[PDB]
Amino acid sequence: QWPAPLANGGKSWASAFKKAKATVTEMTVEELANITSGVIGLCSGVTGAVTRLGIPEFCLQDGPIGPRGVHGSSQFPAGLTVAATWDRTLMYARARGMGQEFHDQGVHLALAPVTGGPLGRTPLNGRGWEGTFADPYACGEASYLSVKGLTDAGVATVSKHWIAYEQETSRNLYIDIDGVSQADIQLPISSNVDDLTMHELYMWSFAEAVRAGTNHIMCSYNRINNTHSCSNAKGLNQLLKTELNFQGGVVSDWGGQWDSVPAAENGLDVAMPGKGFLGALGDFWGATLVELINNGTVSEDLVRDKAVRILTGYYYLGQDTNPPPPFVYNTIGAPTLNATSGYRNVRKPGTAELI
Amino acid sequence: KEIGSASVTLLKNTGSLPLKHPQRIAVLGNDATYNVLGPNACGLANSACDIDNLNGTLTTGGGSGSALSPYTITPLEALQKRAIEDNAEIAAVVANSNTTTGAEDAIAALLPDADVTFVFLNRYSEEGADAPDFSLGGDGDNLMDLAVTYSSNVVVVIHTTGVVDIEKWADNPNVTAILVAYLPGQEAGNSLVPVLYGDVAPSGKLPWTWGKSIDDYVPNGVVYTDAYSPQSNFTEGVFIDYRWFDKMGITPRYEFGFGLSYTTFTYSNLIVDHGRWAKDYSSVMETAEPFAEWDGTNSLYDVIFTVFATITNTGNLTGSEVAQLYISIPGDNQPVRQLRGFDKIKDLPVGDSAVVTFPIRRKDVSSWSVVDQLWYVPNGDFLISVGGSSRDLPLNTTWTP
Numbered sequence: 001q002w003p004a005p006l007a008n009g010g011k012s013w014a015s016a017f018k019k020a021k022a023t024v025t026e027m028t029v030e031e032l033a034n035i036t037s038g039v040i041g042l043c044s045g046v047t048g049a050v051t052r053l054g055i056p057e058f059c060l061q062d063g064p065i066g067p068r069g070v071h072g073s074s075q076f077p078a079g080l081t082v083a084a085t086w087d088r089t090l091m092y093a094r095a096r097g098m099g100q101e102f103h104d105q106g107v108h109l110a111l112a113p114v115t116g117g118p119l120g121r122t123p124l125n126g127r128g129w130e131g132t133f134a135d136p137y138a139c140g141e142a143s144y145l146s147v148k149g150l151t152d153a154g155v156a157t158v159s160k161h162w163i164a165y166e167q168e169t170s171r172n173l174y175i176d177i178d179g180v181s182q183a184d185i186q187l188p189i190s191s192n193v194d195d196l197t198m199h200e201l202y203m204w205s206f207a208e209a210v211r212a213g214t215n216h217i218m219c220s221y222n223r224i225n226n227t228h229s230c231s232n233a234k235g236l237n238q239l240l241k242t243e244l245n246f247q248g249g250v251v252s253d254w255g256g257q258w259d260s261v262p263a264a265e266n267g268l269d270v271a272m273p274g275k276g277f278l279g280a281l282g283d284f285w286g287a288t289l290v291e292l293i294n295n296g297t298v299s300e301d302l303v304r305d306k307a308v309r310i311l312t313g314y315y316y317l318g319q320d321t322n323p324p325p326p327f328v329y330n331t332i333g334a335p336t337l338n339a340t341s342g343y344r345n346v347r348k349p350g351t352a353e354l355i
Numbered sequence: 356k357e358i359g360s361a362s363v364t365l366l367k368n369t370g371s372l373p374l375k376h377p378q379r380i381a382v383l384g385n386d387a388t389y390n391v392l393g394p395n396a397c398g399l400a401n402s403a404c405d406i407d408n409l410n411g412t413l414t415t416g417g418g419s420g421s422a423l424s425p426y427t428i429t430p431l432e433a434l435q436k437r438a439i440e441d442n443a444e445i446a447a448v449v450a451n452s453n454t455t456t457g458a459e460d461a462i463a464a465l466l467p468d469a470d471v472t473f474v475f476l477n478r479y480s481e482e483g484a485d486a487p488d489f490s491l492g493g494d495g496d497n498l499m500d501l502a503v504t505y506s507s508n509v510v511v512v513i514h515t516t517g518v519v520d521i522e523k524w525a526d527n528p529n530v531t532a533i534l535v536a537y538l539p540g541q542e543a544g545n546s547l548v549p550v551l552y553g554d555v556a557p558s559g560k561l562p563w564t565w566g567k568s569i570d571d572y573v574p575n576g577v578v579y580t581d582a583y584s585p586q587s588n589f590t591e592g593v594f595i596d597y598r599w600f601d602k603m604g605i606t607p608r609y610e611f612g613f614g615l616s617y618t619t620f621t622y623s624n625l626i627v628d629h630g631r632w633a634k635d636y637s638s639v640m641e642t643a644e645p646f647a648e649w650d651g652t653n654s655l656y657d658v659i660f661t662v663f664a665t666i667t668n669t670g671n672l673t674g675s676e677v678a679q680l681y682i683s684i685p686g687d688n689q690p691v692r693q694l695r696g697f698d699k700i701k702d703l704p705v706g707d708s709a710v711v712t713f714p715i716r717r718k719d720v721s722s723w724s725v726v727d728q729l730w731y732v733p734n735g736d737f738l739i740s741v742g743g744s745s746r747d748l749p750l751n752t753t754w755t756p
């Protein structure tokens with residue numbers, strides 16, 4: 001079908017890749033499943049530590065205007081708003097500023113920016129404002145610069161949402177809350193997209209995102225030609241990881257992962273949110289992935305590539321020798337998470353006037 | 356603005372004022388922001404808005420003694436200016452807390468993490484009717500109940516046309532400070548915040564008595580009757596406000612001429628100077644008021660003597676002090692004391708002293724002869740008392756002409 005091309009570190013991540021491979025090489029099957037699946041904590045998502053090799057939990061945090069659910073930060077204008085400036089300098093400085101606030105709040109991975117999913121097939125898209133232009137060229141430019149800003153600030157990006165994620169209606173994220181299951185109720189809207197259109201319109205901004213060095217990409221809730229984005233082999237293994245030569249990790253949207261084995265085989269590298277959100281949003285790896293490896297269904301080396309893709313960003317942005325500070329706010333919310341919040345003021349002179 | 360800053364009166368302060376540089380500030384009450392319909396929505400007489408309308412900061416009263424506003428400087432906007440300077444956050448719930456969906460939820464969530472919570476209360480009244488009691492306007496009773504539930508550092512600020520009932524909470528340890536600021540006109544917010552943040556210590560004192568209860572005031576204050584010829588008899592006589600309170604032995608909440616500072620003043624060196632007299636030559640028009648000691652040259656308003664005292668800032672901060680002088684005129688059924696002088700010292704440095712001076716005119720020490728139909732100076736022992744309020748008078752002397 002479409003096999004999983006191994007990470008090699010690409011142009012800029014060469015040394016980071018090699019530190020990643022080295023670390024992954026030392027990891028037990030449990031450790032591999034610990035880092036490739038979400039655990040419980042204060043951030044939108046959290047990767048399990050590899051505590052024996054001193055790899056810590058990574059804080060994944062919303063969102064594309066800056067860290068969400070924190071005090072002591074600034075509320076930046078939306079992507080829609082910078083787009084309207086048609087000013088590359090502002091697009092970059094916006095992201096750079098968002099970036100320092102993410103770093104200084106303690107975020108390893110910013111669940112941002114929005115780089116062409118949604119792009120704007122419908123002017124009614126409920127979350128269209130999070131993107132930029134209704135145009136691949138201009139969106140590509142803003143996406144490039146948005147990615148660079150955040151990464152220059154020392155925070156790994158997760159560009160979102162790959163791909164063809166053009167309506168909120170019946171995205172139908174995976175949720176098995178109460179007795180009921182979305183999987184029984186209704187499958188996600190299937191974006192059915194020819195190959196010219198995928199190439200010339202939707203992939204264009206993501207290509208720019210990859211070129212800018214986005215460390216990760218988030219696969220979307222919709223299905224493409226009736227396969228989930230997060231387990232679409234053509235989309236992740238071929239279009240993204242081969243043609244766009246993407247060297248980083250594919251993070252599930254929160255409930256965008258619907259299965260265990262196809263996901264592992266067809267491009268997904270991180271299961272989010274895992275144990276977070278009471279497990280309500282699916283929890284298909286973790287202990288399940290351990291079992292699948294130990295019984296020969298899934299190759300350990302397949303999962304080592306996932307862990308390598310995750311650690312590449314860690315090492316490239318220097319989070320190993322320059323760790324972000326502790327994240328201090330409960331952004332999940334009680335009663336889902338009963339944790340107290342600290343306080344940290346992260347607002348810096350210059351930010352208000354940039355805004 | 357300077358009128359607002361000189362007027363606003365500090366009734367309670369357990370340690371929370373002045374503010375240093377709080378990082379998380381919570382604000383409660385539509386009094387903190389604009390009239391939702393506009394500052395002049397209520398019309399030519401500030402009385403045409405609906406009874407439940409959120410009128411915003413109470414800057415003037417209702418009726419013929421109101422006036423239009425070019426703008427209102429809301430407490431919130433002024434508090435915000437200051438928060439931004441301190442690189443802090445500030446959030447206000449300004450809806451009706453009882454009737455607005457989620458208001459109560461919002462307050463419950465906002466307040467526990469605030470370093471300080473302001474609650475702005477108001478009590479509108481007007482020409483054409485009397486207040487039916489000491490009742491807070493709109494949702495103020497509710498605001499206060501919620502505020503003390505979720506915060507241990509409530510600072511209450513009252514915009515009112517008169518005394519209001521705050522008995523429920525005034526002794527709540529969670530209410531760390533209480534201020535009234537009356538009707539401050541357009542510069543409402545920027546007159547107040549300097550005081551709160553301690554740029555200028557509060558210097559204003561109550562121009563009437565704050566009784567614990569409407570039942571402690573002159574009986575039959577308002578008479579209600581359908582009677583074709585309604586009747587109020589002033590059987591209390593000269594005994595209104597603190598005169599009544601003083602004679603009946605009633606402790607109020609906050610006495611006439613009371614108001615705290617951010618520093619303390621020690622009174623000393625009482626002096627009555629019989630040689631410091633002068634003839635009234637300045638007043639524009641003269642009365643034909645009759646009096647005993649008249650001799651065709653002199654006046655009721657000649658200053659007969661003059662009295663002096665010394666205040667010393669014994670605190671830790673600069674502050675202004677309104678010195679009061681009261682006199683006990685002897686006679687039968689004569690008030691326990693009557694205010695016959697005040698002198699406000701401006702911005703007295705720590706450790707520094709200043710002399711307070713009070714010109715006592717003749718009329719200031721006279722009674723009306725009901726029988727002889729003239730003003731006359733009684734004989735007896737006149738008490739002279741000087742101090743900070745109508746019940747804080749550390750210096751007395753006696754005079755007998």
Ligand SMILES: *[C@@H]1O[C@H](CO)[C@@H](O[C@@H]2O[C@H](CO)[C@@H](O[C@@H]3O[C@H](CO)[C@@H](O)[C@H](O[C@H]4O[C@H](CO)[C@@H](O)[C@H](O)[C@@H]4O[C@H]4O[C@H](CO)[C@@H](O)[C@H](O)[C@@H]4O)[C@@H]3O)[C@H](O)[C@H]2NC(C)=O)[C@H](O)[C@H]1NC(C)=O
Nearest residue numbers: 192193194195196197198224225227232233234235236239
């Ligand atoms: C969603 O569904 C849509 C609709 O079906 C999908 O769009 C189809 O996408 C496929 C590609 O995945 C595309 O395939 C081609 O059709 C061409 C003719 O129209 C073929 O010529 C072409 O074949 C070449 O490519 C293959 C893949 O590399 C080779 O295996 C094959 O040998 C051919 O290549 C040789 O020859 C050419 C010279 O002719 C040379 O340049 C090459 O290098 C090589 O030597 C494709 O097979 C369909 O045409 C698309 N259909 C439409 C209507 O667009 C879409 O892919 C789906 N999306 C997802 C996410 O699944």
Ligand SMILES: CC(=O)O[C@@]12CO[C@@H]1C[C@H](O)[C@@]1(C)C(=O)[C@H](O)C3=C(C)[C@@H](OC(=O)[C@H](O)[C@@H](NC(=O)c4ccccc4)c4ccccc4)C[C@@](O)([C@@H](OC(=O)c4ccccc4)[C@H]21)C3(C)C
Nearest residue numbers: 397398399400401402403417418419420421481482483484
């Ligand atoms: C009745 C009255 O007090 O009138 C005056 C007009 O000069 C009076 C003095 C007063 O200072 C003045 C200007 C005010 O500023 C008041 O704040 C003021 C009032 C106290 C108010 O008064 C009332 O509402 C009256 O009691 C009321 N009267 C009655 O309905 C009434 C009927 C039978 C017996 C007793 C009373 C009234 C309402 C509306 C229009 C006319 C009369 C009217 C009035 O419109 C205002 O009155 C008018 O504008 C007005 C009055 C009569 C005819 C036309 C206009 C009011 C305002 C501005 C609201």
Ligand SMILES: *[C@@H]1O[C@H](CO)[C@@H](O[C@@H]2O[C@H](CO)[C@@H](O[C@H]3O[C@H](CO)[C@@H](O)[C@H](O)[C@@H]3O)[C@H](O)[C@H]2NC(C)=O)[C@H](O)[C@H]1NC(C)=O
Nearest residue numbers: 397401402403404405406407408410479480483484492493
């Ligand atoms: C906002 O300002 C309003 C004035 O524009 C104010 O409305 C007025 O409130 C008084 C009470 O203070 C009402 O007084 C009268 O109430 C009835 C009238 O039927 C009588 O029994 C009383 O004797 C008394 O005269 C006024 O009627 C009322 N004006 C109108 C037009 O409704 C609001 O109360 C203010 N809002 C708040 C929350 O304080």
Ligand SMILES: *[C@@H]1O[C@H](CO)[C@@H](O[C@@H]2O[C@H](CO)[C@@H](O)[C@H](O)[C@H]2NC(C)=O)[C@H](O)[C@H]1NC(C)=O
Nearest residue numbers: 030031034039047048049050051052055056057
């Ligand atoms: C798999 O990941 C989980 C999630 O982080 C790990 O446990 C935490 O380990 C950190 C140190 O890295 C401790 O500070 C926490 O107390 C642990 N949390 C909990 C919930 O116990 C776990 O250690 C990982 N296991 C392995 C084998 O590495």
Ligand SMILES: OC[C@H]1O[C@@H](O[C@@H]2[C@H](O)[C@@H](O)O[C@H](CO)[C@H]2O)[C@@H](O)[C@@H](O)[C@@H]1O
Nearest residue numbers: 124125126167168169170171172173189
């Ligand atoms: O909770 C979301 C709100 O949705 C409102 O409705 C949307 C429309 O019916 C339509 O566009 O479909 C989407 C789902 O695909 C609906 O969310 C309405 O239902 C409100 O109740 C909700 O507040």
Ligand SMILES: *[C@@H]1O[C@H](CO)[C@@H](O)[C@H](O)[C@H]1NC(C)=O
Nearest residue numbers: 287288291292293295296297
């Ligand atoms: C391997 O484990 C998975 C999950 O525990 C299970 O679904 C699968 O059937 C197992 N296969 C074998 C061959 O034991």
Ligand SMILES: *[C@@H]1O[C@H](CO)[C@@H](O)[C@H](O)[C@H]1NC(C)=O
Nearest residue numbers: 295296297298299300301302
């Ligand atoms: C051998 O093939 C089976 C599927 O037929 C697969 O489960 C197993 O992992 C494969 N081993 C390899 C190639 O790693």
Ligand SMILES: *[C@@H]1O[C@H](CO)[C@@H](O)[C@H](O)[C@H]1NC(C)=O
Nearest residue numbers: 277278334335336337338339
């Ligand atoms: C948090 O607390 C609530 C109420 O105290 C409780 O019902 C809930 O189960 C707790 N949440 C978790 C995830 O333990």
Ligand SMILES: *[C@@H]1O[C@H](CO)[C@@H](O)[C@H](O)[C@H]1NC(C)=O
Nearest residue numbers: 503504505506507527528529
């Ligand atoms: C004071 O506020 C605290 C919350 O800070 C609350 O728990 C307590 O009940 C309040 N006490 C009084 C006397 O209102």
Ligand SMILES: *[C@@H]1O[C@H](CO)[C@@H](O)[C@H](O)[C@H]1NC(C)=O
Nearest residue numbers: 584585586587588589590591
């Ligand atoms: C109060 O006025 C009424 C009305 O004339 C009178 O009958 C009553 O005796 C008066 N009481 C006084 C002056 O105390």
